[PDB]
Amino acid sequence: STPDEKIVLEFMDALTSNDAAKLIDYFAEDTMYQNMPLPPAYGRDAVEQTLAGFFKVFSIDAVETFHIGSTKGLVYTERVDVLRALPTGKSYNVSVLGVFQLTEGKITGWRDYFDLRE
Amino acid sequence: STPDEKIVLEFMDALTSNDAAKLIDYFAEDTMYQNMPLPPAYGRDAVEQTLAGFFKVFSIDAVETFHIGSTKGLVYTERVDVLRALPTGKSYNVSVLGVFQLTEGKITGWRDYFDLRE
Known part of the structure; x- marks a missing residue:
């Protein structure tokens, strides 16, 4: 793996703990999340707040x-x-x-394309 | 229009209020909301919480x-x-x-198909 592919795979491992606080440690301050085609969550605060809100209705x-x-x-x-x-x-x-973008071993960009078929 | 289309058009007008309590009075207790293809919000309490939750990040x-x-x-x-x-x-x-399902002039079923192109 690449050092960046490794980081992504630990993050993927980490997801199952449903811990927004644990997860946001992978993200840089200058970062964003976009659950396509929805408008992005901008900045680290928002991604966290996004993970948290997700972890209150789903495991x-x-x-x-x-x-x-x-x-x-x-x-x-x-x-x-x-x-x-x-x-x-x-x-x-x-x-x-x-789809992840990383700058110096931290996540600066994250776009998800969930399957959206009926 | 039909009495049913009438109720839906009023609900549609009421949306811009961005007010879940105002909106929730259009729904029966036995009801659901499904933002396709997401899993439905089951029951009137859950539809209420879903709108309120929506009205915290969007107008x-x-x-x-x-x-x-x-x-x-x-x-x-x-x-x-x-x-x-x-x-x-x-x-x-x-x-x-x-897409709306009504029973005796109240919403018992609501499904949205938002445009989900990139």
Whole structure:
């Protein structure tokens, strides 16, 4: 792996702890998250606040990563998240591509393309 | 219009209030909201919390409805929402079809299909 692909894979491992505070340590201050095509969450404060809000209605019970790659500086990775809506207990398998930008071993950009088919 | 299309058009007008309590009175207790393809919000409390949660990061500055109709007992309407993200001030126009199920003049089912192109 690249040092950047390694970082991304630890972050992917980390997701299942559903810990926004644990997760935001991977992100630089100058950073953003965009759950496509939704408008981005800008800055570290917002990404955290985004993870937190996500962790109050869902648990990530599992992440199965089945691809990791890189081109032109960006790490590309593909996974299936096993999502469990906490107010129901129902579980959902959904695919998602994660596109990461890193500057000096910290996340400066993160775009998710969840599978959005009916 | 039908009495059912009438109720939906009023609800549509009430949206710009950005007020969940105002909005929630259109829904029966046995009801649901589903932002496709996301899992539904089950029951009236959950629809309430979902709007309120939406009204903390966005304002609905304008609903421009350009279509309303009905088939099989369900009301279909189409609009463009002008969305302003509260943490940034940036505005966005997005289209969405609304599919409504009513029982005795109250909403028992609401599904949104927002335009999800990149």
